[model samples]
Target: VVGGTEAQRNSWPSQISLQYRSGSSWAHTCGGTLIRQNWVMTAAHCVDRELTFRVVVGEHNLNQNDGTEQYVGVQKIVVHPYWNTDDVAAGYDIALLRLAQSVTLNSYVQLGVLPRAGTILANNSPCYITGWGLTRTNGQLAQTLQQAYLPTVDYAICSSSSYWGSTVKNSMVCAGGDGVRSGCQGDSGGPLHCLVNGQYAVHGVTSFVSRLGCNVTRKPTVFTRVSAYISWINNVIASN
Candidate 1:
């Protein structure tokens, strides 16, 4: 994230690093949230490529081993049936990854709490976007996880002419249009955690940022609204 601070270790127990097998090493490609012991929520675009993917739970730093990381192979991927690779603005950017085996939960690795179905936060709701995405547009990815406060931007304002226009749909959540702090490349498929009832819940899945830059005025980071797909998620999990 641009203009973000290093997240405290273990602050986000449900956060994960989605990596793909490179020539001789595994490379972090996107961020994810562990919603179940063996299930993860991510962006469909992240897994669109045909590559071998693995997930690392309890990861803090990409270059450092903190002895809390648990690596697992991905057993199956279920992208939303309506998701269209060529039209991300039309929504349906969410995806779920089933792990080969369930990872044991610990202080540093836990399941992400998801918002109730159809729960929509009010405008300017307090939330945080955390990930290993680029610190700036065209910049390199962060070695350690970073977090930035991103207030919610109501759909009315986010869909106005000067903002994201019709590209920002009701099925998405907009946040951090301050032109300072925002989600960036490599952060896709991460969670947008919102505080509700004194606890944080996974309400969004980082999907897109301004094409102009990482942080652009009136162009907040857009996420796939998790509340809009709770039933779909449940159905996939139950039948998979």
Candidate 2:
């Protein structure tokens, strides 16, 4: 994230690091949220490479050892049925990965609570975007996890002529258009946690930012609205 701060070890227990095998080691590619013991929520784009992927739970730092880390293999990947990777702006950018075995929960690893179905936060609602993305556009991966207070930008303002215009949709959540702090590359598929009823819920799956740059004016980080597809998520888990 641009202009982000190091996340606390126990602050985001649901946050996960999505990685792809690189030589003998693994490299962080994106961020995800642990929605279930065996399931993770992420963006469809992150799986576009078809590369073998793994999920690291309780991971606070990638470069340095964090005793809380738990690595798991992805046994199956299920992308949105209507997802068109080439058309991310069209929405439906979400995906799910099923782990070979359920992960054990702890202080550093836990399931992410999702927003209630059909729930919508008010405009400019308080929220935080967390990920192991980058500190700048076209920059290197961060050694540690980062987070920023990226307030929600309502659909009206986000899709306005001066903003994302038609590219924004009701199926998505827009936040942190502030030119100083936002989600960038390597942060895709992370969580946008919004506090509601005194409880934090995962409301977003980091999708994309402005093509011009990561932290550009009027280009708040875009995310797949989790509330919009709550039924789909349940169906997938129930059926599979």
Candidate 3:
């Protein structure tokens, strides 16, 4: 996140660190949401590279050894068939990873509740983008998880010429065009938690930001609308 604060432990229990082997160590590459004990929802672009991946649940600090953490290997990865690595703006940037083992649910580890299919939030709806991404554009990644309030920008407004233009699709959600707080590098594949009916639900999977910068004005963070892929998600899990 460009501008965010250290998130409280257990504040977003479904949040996970998607890491890949880096020589003898593992490096955090993206964030993901635990949708099932063995399934994770993330951005397809995150797994474009062929590398061994693992997920760490209940992880608040990237460098700390929190006893609540549960590390597991990724057994399979299924990226959306229509996702194009050269064209994230084309919009099918979603993916799912099946874990090697089911993680135990606890105060610091739980499944993320997803929004129902076709559910759309009103303009400027309250939401938070959480991750251990960068603190600023071209900056270092935060050791601890961080979160920023990123209000939703309605499609009508986000698609304007000055904003994201036609690159913002109806099947995606745009939030935080404030140019001060937004998702940055390493935040992709994280969840955009939105409040609805007094409950929070995972409504989006962080997909892209502007090529210009991380927190550019009128270039809010873009996400793959989770509600738009409920059937695909279910099908993938069922057939896998």
- Cα lDDT for residue 227, candidate 3: 97
Overall local distance difference test of candidate 2: 0.94
Error of 3 at 141 (Å): 0.8
Per-candidate total of colliding backbone pairs: 0, 0, 0
- lDDT against the true structure, per candidate, is 0.96, 0.94, 0.96
Candidate 1 residue-wise lDDT at 88: 100
- The order by descending lDDT is 1, 3, 2
Residue 144 shift from truth in candidate 3, angstroms: 0.6
lDDT of 3 by residue, 1-240 (tens): 999999999799999999999999999999999999999999999999999999999999999898899999999999999999999989999999999999999999999999999999999999999999989999989999999999999999999999988899999999999989999999999999999999999999999988889999999999999999999999999999
Which residues of candidate 1, in runs, are more than 4 Å off? none
> Which pairs of residues have clashing backbones in candidate 2?
none
Worst 10 residues of 1 by lDDT: 209-218
Model 1 TM-score is 0.99
